[PDB]
Structure 1
Amino acid sequence: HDGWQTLKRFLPYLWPADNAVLRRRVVGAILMVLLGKATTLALPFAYKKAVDAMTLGGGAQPALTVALAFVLAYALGRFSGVLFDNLRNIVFERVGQDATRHLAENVFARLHKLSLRFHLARRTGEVTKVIERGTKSIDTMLYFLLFNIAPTVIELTAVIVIFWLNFGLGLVTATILAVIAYVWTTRTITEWRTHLREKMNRLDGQALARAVDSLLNYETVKYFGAESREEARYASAARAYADAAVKSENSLGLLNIAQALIVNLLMAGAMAWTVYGWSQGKLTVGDLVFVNTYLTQLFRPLDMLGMVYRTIRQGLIDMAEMFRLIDTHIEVADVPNAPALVVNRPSVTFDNVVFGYDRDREILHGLSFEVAAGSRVAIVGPSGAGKSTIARLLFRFYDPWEGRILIDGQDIAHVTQTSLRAALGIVPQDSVLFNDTIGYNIAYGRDGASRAEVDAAAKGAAIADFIARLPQGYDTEVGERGLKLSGGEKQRVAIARTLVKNPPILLFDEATSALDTRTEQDILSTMRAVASHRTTISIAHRLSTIADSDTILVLDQGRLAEQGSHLDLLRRDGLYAEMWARQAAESAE
């Protein structure tokens, strides 16, 4: 966390060396800065020459011409100064916005490329609040640091050197002492004011909370005649808040008093010195109005320094946070020169696969099997065998500790991630919808998803009647901030999403676990309809719902416990039959 290395990391994001309009815009910005401060310091010189030409008219008879010219130059220079300041804002704001936009885009890209255990260790609300806080603080920090500190320090040093010329050292040390004591008392009294403002804010919150609670318990307040009690309570809270606000305004008043006091003492000293220097004939009358406009134009923008230090510290913190989110590497990555996963026979094999979510509790121990292509295979077990992890390890969200999963005899740990996630399909246990229209949710499965594929999936999931019954049809806004949908409808949406994706391999990760029995019995026929020519793996909780599979593999504590057809297991009369009778009695009860 250092300003040097932090801003040096930021420096390519402002100076890209790739966009010529960007580098031209930033050099035009600093050009406008220097031009504005130059004309601002250069105008009162012309004003002094005007007053000198008007007062020494014994030698210069066309004082009309000379004074009129220098005076019009003064007015045009003032207008040009404000013109150049607003032009530097106009040229520079797009640069600032594009810098913070590229930084936000890059942290978003690195964030979405980051691995799943990052999104489980922290919360997505924390991440989005830190990035919006980052872009706001970086924008205001860049604006403040480049548009107050550099122009004020240029103006201050030029005023110091322009008083080193044309005047003695006494004016220079007087001005620099006034500047030092000014910024010192401003920083101290602003820290005191911020302390008072924090106290006033929390007292205000207490008063408002007392008010709303006393209003909300109106029935009991009537039940005990405590209206005078509650009025006195609210009055006490409001009185304390009023006294805190009065002390805050007292702090601001003392700030303005100190600032005006020190600047007027400096102005009195400088003007007395220059009128004495006129009296002993060294200095003309223009030097009075010279230092007069200099001081009143100098001491205005110096007030910001205390809040500038705070804002630049906050911007440094936020940029360090965004850069840390950049440099956080991914746990799972593709191998260098990753070949594409090629499928001709969508076969799965688990091979001695070892997994747990965390290293201190191993959940997957000894699974090794083969799922033939085109078949209907089934996974079931108790709540403690941990059947839910199989889809997440098949999608290469986590790599296994030991063992390997091969698709088509090829290591999915050794292929391209996008091809592996392309050849697969999943119905999640909890279906989720984007806050958008339903047609975009259906077309979400493929990037260039066509409308013919959209209503093809809508008839394939048997939801086309539901899209006909909607008022806006496919263009109905759904999800949050839209029309809520039922669970079976959402699962049909997920089925249509998978059919838009069209994989050879699909998975049901407890697709009916949160649904009712009617939607269940309706949806199993649909699942068999998608299960025409694909390799289908189904993990379920209610065995009757998977009673029709080709084979069932029953898992226990990370071991392939049982394997075989439903008739074979209900003839073997073991844990399968026990769970079956358990589910039968639990459904009968």
Structure 2
Amino acid sequence: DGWQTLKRFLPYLWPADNAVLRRRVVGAILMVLLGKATTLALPFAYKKAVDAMTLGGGAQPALTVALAFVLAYALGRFSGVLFDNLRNIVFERVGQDATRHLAENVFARLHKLSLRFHLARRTGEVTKVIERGTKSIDTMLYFLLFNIAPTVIELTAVIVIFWLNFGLGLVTATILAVIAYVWTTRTITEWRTHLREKMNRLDGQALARAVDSLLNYETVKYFGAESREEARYASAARAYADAAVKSENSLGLLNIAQALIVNLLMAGAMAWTVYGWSQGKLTVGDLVFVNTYLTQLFRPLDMLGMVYRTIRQGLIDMAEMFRLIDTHIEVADVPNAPALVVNRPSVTFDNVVFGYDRDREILHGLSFEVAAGSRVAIVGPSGAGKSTIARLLFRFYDPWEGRILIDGQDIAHVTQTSLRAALGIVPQDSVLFNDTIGYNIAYGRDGASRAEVDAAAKGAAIADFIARLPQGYDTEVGERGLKLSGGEKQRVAIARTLVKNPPILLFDEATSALDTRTEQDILSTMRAVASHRTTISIAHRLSTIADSDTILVLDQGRLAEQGSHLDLLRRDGLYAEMWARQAA
């Protein structure tokens, strides 16, 4: 509930560092206290000012006493407002710092979590949650913190004052009033919360549908599907509006009940006071006093019945953000993991059995050894699952059984960072940042110099194409570089991995989008650049890999045939069939 959320948020407000920020909170609390004391004082001055005017005076009738007391009243009101604005000004920095640290922590945690949480994740939910939560925590914190506590202080103070100045039927009346108020408010809020949860869930679903439609604009255009999308959005919007109408009607009923109770209590107290006046026990200033005290007390509470809905939503949103921060990490490093030390880059697969889900096993005891410095190819027909090999090597997931070794070391027992530092990959579908081509190429290593980018662009055979562009390296690619052709994007990917210069390199359909001459050029660069590293090339078109040291042919998640190109042509098996057929 909300109480747990606030208890979780409380450590951020009173940090255990920054000795400077801690003092400001104390000062702000002191300002709050002075403001309350002044606003509490001013009605006693008003009551006495009224008392003086009627039934004689002490020096002069009203020339001096009435003027002095009216000016004291006005100056008091102004002083209270001044203190309130001063507390706001002093406090605002602590809040800004607290929310900045919350945002930074959530961002870091989201980058640390496992990919399986990224494979099915809607863009709209994450973006909406972070934007909404930052705005939410600022609004909720200010309204919550600075319009509830002083009212409690004033309620206790008023109880004390009634104690000191009257008989205690007033005390019993007010205590019963507060008890009724709390019980009624709680039961109504309980009824209201289920409908609130339903409304919020429907809103989130509608927004995610809308974003997916907008994100697939090309496909919606190709098939003329505009009307279908419009109807699909319209239905969700109507359902949401209905739920909202029910929610606000219940809010209105709760507000009417609360105002009835409050005004009943005021009626009763004023009546008892006038009855007491009839017997000559009390002056009429007592009447003015009680009236002013009650209205001053109840103004902050009546203010709230029109900011309720927002505060509620804010509290929900903050709970949501903590929920996101709490989800656990599926794949983590072991305790005290040693660093990876790569001296001779052999690769061993030892009886690896794996699948994404327990109901579909994909690899069936695949074992093989890739010798250091050798050039090997991995081929198979479609659906083979060869792209898992690579995804497993980077430890995006762990094997159910068996193990992977690099230089004789179990990759489950080493640090993730050294492992991924030792490996380079060129994937099938490469994504570009929304920035210049020069930034995208320099991204491979921290601080890439002009010489490294020039060398890589030469090795990638894109130098002339860039030279003929008007803006050169500053040509914008757009979103996912959708402004560049496929061969251009694949060349940028090759350049990136060239800039990394990793000891072990993986080509994952690296050449599939290029023309023949470009292909032969980059293939020659790849052969030259492979001098003393382990290179694994996964290719569809066999002619580009026929000179490999060894070829692994996978079918249906297992190793069907293994050996050199000549051995497989002699065996007359699957490889021979594939190659012969393709040649014709």
Change (3 A) 1:63 1:439: farther
CA contact (8 A) 2:124 2:211 kept: no
Change (3 A) 1:263 1:418: closer
CA contact (8 A) 1:552 1:566 kept: yes
1:237 and 1:560 mapped to 2: Cα distance?
A: 50
Change (3 A) 1:545 1:60: farther
1:344 and 1:293 mapped to 2: Cα distance?
A: 85
CA contact (8 A) 1:183 1:302 kept: no
Change (3 A) 1:550 1:136: same
| Stretch deviating more after TM superposition (384-393 or 59-68) | 59-68
CA contact (8 A) 1:510 1:539 kept: yes
Q: Deviations over 1:44-74 (max 9, x none)?
A: 2223333344546632349655554443332
CA contact (8 A) 1:488 1:519 kept: no
Q: Deviations over 1:213-241 (max 9, x none)?
A: 99999999999999999999999999999
Q: Secondary structure at the match of 2:60?
A: coil
Q: Deviations over 1:187-245 (max 9, x none)?
A: 99999999999999999999999999999999999999999999999999999999999
| Stretch deviating more after TM superposition (424-433 or 335-344) | 335-344
Q: Deviations over 1:324-363 (max 9, x none)?
A: 4444332322232222212233332223333222333332
Change (3 A) 1:20 1:546: same
1:100 and 1:224 mapped to 2: Cα distance?
A: 45
Q: Does residue 454 of structure 2 align to residue 455 of structure 1?
A: yes
Q: Secondary structure at the match of 1:366?
A: strand
| Stretch deviating more after TM superposition (75-84 or 56-65) | 56-65
Deviation (angstroms), 1:508: 1.2
| Stretch deviating more after TM superposition (324-333 or 535-544) | 324-333
Q: Deviations over 1:24-49 (max 9, x none)?
A: 23333333333332222222222333
Task: Give unpaired runs (5+ residues) of structure 2.
Answer: none
1:194 and 1:167 mapped to 2: Cα distance?
A: 42
1:505 and 1:543 mapped to 2: Cα distance?
A: 22
Change (3 A) 1:41 1:328: same
Change (3 A) 1:198 1:312: closer
Deviation (angstroms), 1:322: 3.9
2:219 and 2:432 mapped to 1: Cα distance?
A: 44
Q: Secondary structure at the match of 2:307?
A: helix
- Structure 2 equivalent of residue 294 of structure 1: 293
Q: Secondary structure at the match of 1:478?
A: coil
Q: Deviations over 1:415-437 (max 9, x none)?
A: 22111111111111111122233
Deviation (angstroms), 1:308: 7.6
2:251 and 2:160 mapped to 1: Cα distance?
A: 33
What's the RMSD between the two structures over aligned residues? 6.5
Q: Deviations over 1:539-573 (max 9, x none)?
A: 12222233343322212334333233334433433
Change (3 A) 1:333 1:77: same
Change (3 A) 1:241 1:281: same
Change (3 A) 1:174 1:473: farther
Q: Deviations over 1:385-440 (max 9, x none)?
A: 31111111111112223332222333222222111111111111111122233333
| Stretch deviating more after TM superposition (269-278 or 430-439) | 269-278
1:320 and 1:44 mapped to 2: Cα distance?
A: 41
1:469 and 1:68 mapped to 2: Cα distance?
A: 87
Equivalenced residue count is 584
Q: Secondary structure at the match of 1:62?
A: coil
1:502 and 1:214 mapped to 2: Cα distance?
A: 40
CA contact (8 A) 1:174 1:266 kept: yes
Change (3 A) 1:361 1:234: closer
CA contact (8 A) 1:187 1:306 kept: no
Give the structure-2-normalised TM-score.
0.79
Change (3 A) 1:462 1:65: farther
CA contact (8 A) 1:186 1:306 kept: no
1:233 and 1:395 mapped to 2: Cα distance?
A: 41
1:294 and 1:530 mapped to 2: Cα distance?
A: 86
| Stretch deviating more after TM superposition (375-384 or 515-524) | 515-524
Change (3 A) 1:348 1:479: farther
Q: Deviations over 1:81-115 (max 9, x none)?
A: 22233333334443334333323322332222222
1:91 and 1:277 mapped to 2: Cα distance?
A: 46
Deviation (angstroms), 1:293: 2.6
1:426 and 1:309 mapped to 2: Cα distance?
A: 53
CA contact (8 A) 2:31 2:87 kept: yes
Deviation (angstroms), 1:575: 1.0
- Structure 1 equivalent of residue 402 of structure 2: 403
CA contact (8 A) 2:47 2:288 kept: yes
| Stretch deviating more after TM superposition (232-241 or 43-52) | 232-241
Change (3 A) 1:83 1:184: farther
2:539 and 2:294 mapped to 1: Cα distance?
A: 81
| Stretch deviating more after TM superposition (460-469 or 540-549) | 460-469
CA contact (8 A) 1:425 1:503 kept: yes
Q: Secondary structure at the match of 2:71?
A: helix
| Stretch deviating more after TM superposition (307-316 or 322-331) | 307-316
Give the structure-1-normalised TM-score.
0.79
Q: Secondary structure at the match of 2:434?
A: coil
| Stretch deviating more after TM superposition (10-19 or 198-207) | 198-207
CA contact (8 A) 1:186 1:303 kept: no
2:170 and 2:429 mapped to 1: Cα distance?
A: 76
Change (3 A) 1:408 1:78: same
1:140-539 correspondence runs (5 A): 140-172=139-171, 270-271=269-270, 273-275=272-274, 277-278=276-277, 280-303=279-302, 318-480=317-479, 484-513=483-512, 520=519, 523-528=522-527, 530-539=529-538
CA contact (8 A) 2:378 2:539 kept: yes
2:296 and 2:339 mapped to 1: Cα distance?
A: 68
| Stretch deviating more after TM superposition (83-92 or 265-274) | 265-274
| Stretch deviating more after TM superposition (324-333 or 426-435) | 324-333
| Stretch deviating more after TM superposition (339-348 or 120-129) | 120-129
Deviation (angstroms), 1:380: 0.5
CA contact (8 A) 1:145 1:308 kept: no
2:461 and 2:39 mapped to 1: Cα distance?
A: 74
| Stretch deviating more after TM superposition (227-236 or 339-348) | 227-236
2:444 and 2:130 mapped to 1: Cα distance?
A: 28
CA contact (8 A) 2:460 2:494 kept: yes
CA contact (8 A) 2:444 2:499 kept: yes
| Stretch deviating more after TM superposition (379-388 or 31-40) | 31-40
- Structure 2 equivalent of residue 549 of structure 1: 548
| Stretch deviating more after TM superposition (491-500 or 2-11) | 2-11
2:348 and 2:14 mapped to 1: Cα distance?
A: 51
Deviation (angstroms), 1:536: 1.4
| Stretch deviating more after TM superposition (298-307 or 533-542) | 298-307
CA contact (8 A) 2:49 2:69 kept: yes
Deviation (angstroms), 1:515: 5.7
CA contact (8 A) 1:506 1:536 kept: yes
Deviation (angstroms), 1:303: 3.7
Change (3 A) 1:70 1:468: farther
CA contact (8 A) 2:436 2:477 kept: yes
Change (3 A) 1:274 1:433: same
CA contact (8 A) 1:477 1:483 kept: no
CA contact (8 A) 2:433 2:481 kept: no
- Structure 2 equivalent of residue 119 of structure 1: 118
Percent identity for Structure 1 against Structure 2:
100
Q: Deviations over 1:444-479 (max 9, x none)?
A: 222343444334433332334444444544344433
| Stretch deviating more after TM superposition (492-501 or 265-274) | 265-274
Q: Secondary structure at the match of 2:364?
A: strand
| Stretch deviating more after TM superposition (46-55 or 488-497) | 46-55
Deviation (angstroms), 1:507: 0.5
